[PDB]
């Protein structure tokens, strides 16, 4: 949004369970590279368990081995960072200019908050 924060780095950990991420590490194999997996469990916030959506395999990858993926408008997302982090949102529209998205909070008393400028790195495709 209209923030004087030139850096959108809220928290260095962004791994939340029940989100889809893309494996950009290739460390476990190319069969896992650029593939989509769901976080089954986060261990130490910087490390999480991802179950391959396609392969079905259970992997143990660090945040640096994973990348947040952004769905289409109308889909649910999990906001990972910011003052809304931990909440669920619906993707309204994306801003590829700032690499951010417009999401509306769908959880708690914050439900109904359509907040814009949420970086693709601060949200994830909800499982």
CATH number at residue 64: 2.30.30.140
Dihedral sign for Cα atoms in the order 37, 111, 74, 98: negative
Residues 76 and 127 in one domain: yes
DSSP state of 70: -
Please give the method by which this entry was determined. Answer: NMR
Q: List the Cα angle 85/110/3 in 5-degree steps.
A: 60
DSSP state of 18: S
* Residue 92 within a domain: yes
Q: Could you list the residue range(s) of the whole structural domain that residue 36 is in? A: 18-70
Tokens of 103: 């999401």
Q: 57-62, long-range: CB within 8 Å, 24+ apart, which pairs?
A: 57/32, 59/23, 59/28, 59/32, 61/23, 61/25, 61/27, 61/28
The span from the CA of 122 to the CA of 101, in Å, is 9
Residues 65 and 75 in one domain: no
Residues 66 and 79 in one domain: no
Of residues 4, 12, 5, 59, the one with CA closest to residue 31: 59
Of residues 102, 112, 110, the one with CA closest to residue 72: 102
Of residues 7, 118, 6, 3, the one with CA closest to residue 68: 118
Residues 54 and 79 in one domain: no
């Amino acid at each position: 949004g209209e923030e004087e924060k030139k850096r959108t780095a809220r928290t260095d950990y962004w791994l939340q369970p029940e989100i889809i991420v893309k494996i950009i590490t290739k460390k476990l194999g190319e069969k896992y590279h650029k593939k989509k997996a769901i976080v089954k469990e986060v261990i130490d916030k910087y490390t999480a368990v991802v179950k391959m959506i396609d392969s079905g395999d259970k992997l143990k990858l660090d945040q640096t081995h994973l990348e947040t993926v952004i769905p289409a408008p109308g889909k649910r997302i999990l906001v990972l960072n910011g003052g809304y982090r931990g909440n669920e949102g619906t993707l309204e529209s994306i801003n590829e200019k700032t690499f951010s998205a417009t999401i509306v909070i769908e959880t708690g008393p914050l439900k109904g908050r359509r907040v814009e400028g949420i970086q693709y790195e601060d949200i994830s495709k909800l499982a």
